[PDB]
């Protein structure tokens, strides 16, 4: 995981993870999103870096990194970069039990 605070810090954490994926998580589905994001950012970091070793996830601290990545692609929001270039954009939020949303999330190219 390469936690972002911006579209600059979202595309920077993206470009840093050039071999694997870097799934920027711009905002969330409301409901005290900061604490839930870091808690999901641990179990997913176990399911993504340790279990899968395929993707990092950069929970973008409140900006419009999702809209700028969706703009730069042409193709809460979820921007999945490949060598710092917009490859996969999917919009939609989730409540506290977002394991179903995460299972639904797994897995588009």
């Amino acid at each position: 995981t390469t936690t972002v605070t911006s579209e600059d810090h979202f595309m920077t954490f993206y470009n840093e993870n050039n071999k694997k994926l870097i799934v920027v998580d711009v905002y969330p589905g409301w409901s005290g999103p900061c604490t839930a994001m870091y808690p999901t950012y641990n179990q997913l970091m176990i399911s993504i870096d340790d279990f899968e070793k395929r993707i990092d996830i950069l929970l973008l601290d409140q900006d419009k990194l999702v809209t700028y990545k969706n703009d730069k692609f042409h193709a809460p929001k979820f921007l999945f970069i490949s060598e710092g270039k917009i490859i996969d954009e999917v919009l939609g939020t989730n409540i506290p039990v977002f394991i179903e949303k995460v299972n639904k999330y797994i897995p588009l190219s």
Binding site: K19, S47, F51, E52, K53, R54, I106, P107, S109
Partner: protein, 242 residues
Amino acid sequence: INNAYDTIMVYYHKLTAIEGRALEYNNLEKLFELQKSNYKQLKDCMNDLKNLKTMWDAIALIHFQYNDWKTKPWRQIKADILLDTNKTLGTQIKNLPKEIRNFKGYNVIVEKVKNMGTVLPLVSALHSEFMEDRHWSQLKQITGTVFDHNSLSFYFEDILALNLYKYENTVNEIVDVAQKEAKIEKKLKNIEQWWSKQVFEFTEYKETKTFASLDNMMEVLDQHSLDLMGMKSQGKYVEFFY
């Protein structure tokens, strides 16, 4: 995971060569169908590569559930294993139905997942604790497995060597005989508890202690005895403590 990303490079190399052809054809021009068909041949190989991609992806998710399983063997826990066995069985069933179409050789992978579910049913039986060591030894004699009912934490790996398909019937037959014995023992424990704790108190009449309300416990003996009559009446598991 390395082999997958390695394959990713070979495909990108093929797509490049693929382009270098598609250039040469258009450069030629002249409306030749053979130029466009060689392309139709290449696009086929690209889609097949993409299938292989989604396949290797499924394998990685599979290893993640297989990795969670070995951690739960070390953790063990009778109450934890039963709950773990239920959810994993549900998740495993979910993955197999998700798998469809793609290329050939996928059946080889699906059977590996099918073997994973059978072990999940066995873990739940260890969880219940309906079998003793004496029951575990008789099945172990037929099984010929060095590891007992509750040997160690790495026993989940050892249980693998004894094929789930080849040694489910024997273990199932073993686990079934155990449950009948757990039931048969519990009645003996219910009966042993009744005779252990009883009280025929002495109620004074004129100048003599007397057995008053002896019927109330006399009724309980008739039920226990009718159980013990029923306990002698067959019971495969009865025979051991018969």
